Amino acid sequence: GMETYDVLVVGGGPGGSTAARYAAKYGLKTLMIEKRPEIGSPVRCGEGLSKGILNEADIKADRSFIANEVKGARIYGPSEKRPIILQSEKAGNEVGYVLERDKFDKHLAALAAKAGADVWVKSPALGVIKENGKVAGAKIRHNNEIVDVRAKMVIAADGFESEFGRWAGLKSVILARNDIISALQYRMINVDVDPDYTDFYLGSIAPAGYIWVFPKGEGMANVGIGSSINWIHNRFELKNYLDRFIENHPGLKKGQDIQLVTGGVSVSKVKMPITMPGLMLVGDAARLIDPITGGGIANAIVSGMYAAQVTKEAIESNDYSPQMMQKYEKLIKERFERKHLRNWVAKEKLAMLSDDTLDKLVDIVSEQVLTTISVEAILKAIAEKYPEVVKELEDLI
Numbered sequence: 001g002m003e004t005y006d007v008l009v010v011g012g013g014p015g016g017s018t019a020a021r022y023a024a025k026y027g028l029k030t031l032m033i034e035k036r037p038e039i040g041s042p043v044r045c046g047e048g049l050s051k052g053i054l055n056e057a058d059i060k061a062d063r064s065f066i067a068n069e070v071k072g073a074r075i076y077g078p079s080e081k082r083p084i085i086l087q088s089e090k091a092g093n094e095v096g097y098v099l100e101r102d103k104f105d106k107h108l109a110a111l112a113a114k115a116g117a118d119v120w121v122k123s124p125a126l127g128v129i130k131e132n133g134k135v136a137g138a139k140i141r142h143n144n145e146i147v148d149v150r151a152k153m154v155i156a157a158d159g160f161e162s163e164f165g166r167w168a169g170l171k172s173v174i175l176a177r178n179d180i181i182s183a184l185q186y187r188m189i190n191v192d193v194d195p196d197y198t199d200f201y202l203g204s205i206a207p208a209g210y211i212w213v214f215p216k217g218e219g220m221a222n223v224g225i226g227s228s229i230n231w232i233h234n235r236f237e238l239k240n241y242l243d244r245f246i247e248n249h250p251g252l253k254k255g256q257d258i259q260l261v262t263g264g265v266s267v268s269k270v271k272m273p274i275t276m277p278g279l280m281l282v283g284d285a286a287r288l289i290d291p292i293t294g295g296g297i298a299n300a301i302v303s304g305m306y307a308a309q310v311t312k313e314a315i316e317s318n319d320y321s322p323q324m325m326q327k328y329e330k331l332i333k334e335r336f337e338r339k340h341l342r343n344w345v346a347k348e349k350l351a352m353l354s355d356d357t358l359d360k361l362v363d364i365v366s367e368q369v370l371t372t373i374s375v376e377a378i379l380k381a382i383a384e385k386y387p388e389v390v391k392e393l394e395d396l397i
């Protein structure tokens, strides 16, 4: 086959669906493609999302894709004595959600289709087409044939593997090993947890990362570990760390697992360039996961919006120059560069701390409930009460 579009979006996760929806709202003839036969499945995510992005992206919170609302987050040190608690000043209100990521991704893809985007599933991009000095489309497998899709702008939202950008020639997205987290997670049922809180566990129990417990309601939880690949050798060792943690927590040990997933998370500083003429990378493909939290859902949605915005300006003025592409890079840097620099420095330092030091830090920060739901609020409390451990972040908090 052959096709002509204004915009081709490679990938049907939250980043791609967001880019495609906004491109279509912006009047552009848009195709979104997804490699997998089903949008959203299988789920390879903790499904944790802070509340604000749904408002920012104009997505209505619906129970069909929200498993559980949480009132706060708790962060435990190695001895699990008293946790840092982050929760709103107001009595009842929710700070975030644990999603059904599959239903969420389907909902976002449906918003894209409603806005006017075409959507292909079981339709991987195979490689990149260039012409007249710009990325000009992709070869795509669709219904057992190779289709040549020409587009004025390609938005690559193809996840952690970031194939399209690599094929196109962007070296900036190649990660150093110290910025790669190997993650492993069980979906558990019949566990005894507190569905008001997403819990995070720090220490040598999860080297150079953390263990999390995200409740879904009705005795279900996502229970995972993430560790920098330079610390935990292989995935069987990673699984052993998580299993030991579960064994040592009676409320988790009594449950059953129904799913086991693995995946990679980037924890890098912002990477430039993430464009070339005709091409913008979004979400995980652009290495926009938060270096301290490992969260990328919100950042994929934000970057998809920004990519669609600049794509509109590019097509309406037929200006695909590096200077035009750099407007997208400017939005990304303004939103994320300083935050991710701070967070990258923080995670590099945190990886070197002993269990005793972590216990001390959590003891100090957990003296007051934090009512600003942010990493910045945690870092500032450390900067103030325990400046010794955060001297490296001096200019950055």
Ligand SMILES: Cc1cc2nc3c(=O)[nH]c(=O)nc-3n(C[C@H](O)[C@H](O)[C@H](O)COP(=O)(O)OP(=O)(O)OC[C@H]3O[C@@H](n4cnc5c(N)ncnc54)[C@H](O)[C@@H]3O)c2cc1C
Pocket (backbone or CB within 6 Å): 010, 011, 012, 013, 014, 015, 016, 033, 034, 035, 036, 040, 044, 045, 046, 047, 048, 049, 123, 124, 125, 126, 157, 158, 159, 160, 163, 183, 184, 185, 224, 261, 262, 263, 264, 265, 282, 283, 284, 285, 289, 294, 295, 296, 297, 298, 300
């Ligand atoms: C174990 C684990 C737990 C996590 N926990 C959280 C969490 O709780 N909260 C959070 O915010 N973040 C979490 N993350 C990160 C989060 O899941 C991602 O940041 C998020 O999915 C990024 O969205 P995206 O659209 O950029 O990428 P993706 O959701 O990965 O979507 C990219 C899509 O591109 C498709 N694709 C790939 N190659 C091609 C190709 N050649 N052609 C066409 N399509 C292609 C893929 O099939 C995929 O559907 C977690 C990650 C892991 C691995």
Ligand SMILES: CCCCCC/C=C\CCCCC(=O)O[C@H](COC(=O)CCCCCCC/C=C\CCCCCCCC)COP(=O)(O)OC[C@@H](O)CO
Pocket (backbone or CB within 6 Å): 046, 048, 049, 050, 073, 075, 086, 181, 183, 200, 208, 209, 210, 212, 224, 225, 226, 227, 265, 267, 291, 292, 293, 294, 295, 296, 339, 347, 350, 351, 361, 362, 373, 374, 375, 376, 378
């Ligand atoms: C001594 C204590 C040190 C703390 C260590 C950190 C540990 C746990 C993080 C809990 C943070 C709770 C919070 O405030 O959440 C939201 C953001 O959304 C989230 O944090 C939810 C994302 C959940 C992602 C799960 C990813 C699982 C995969 C791998 C895990 C390993 C990753 C390891 C990274 C390296 C870390 C050592 C608000 O953030 P802010 O985006 O910052 O909100 C403000 C913004 O408006 C902009 O300023």
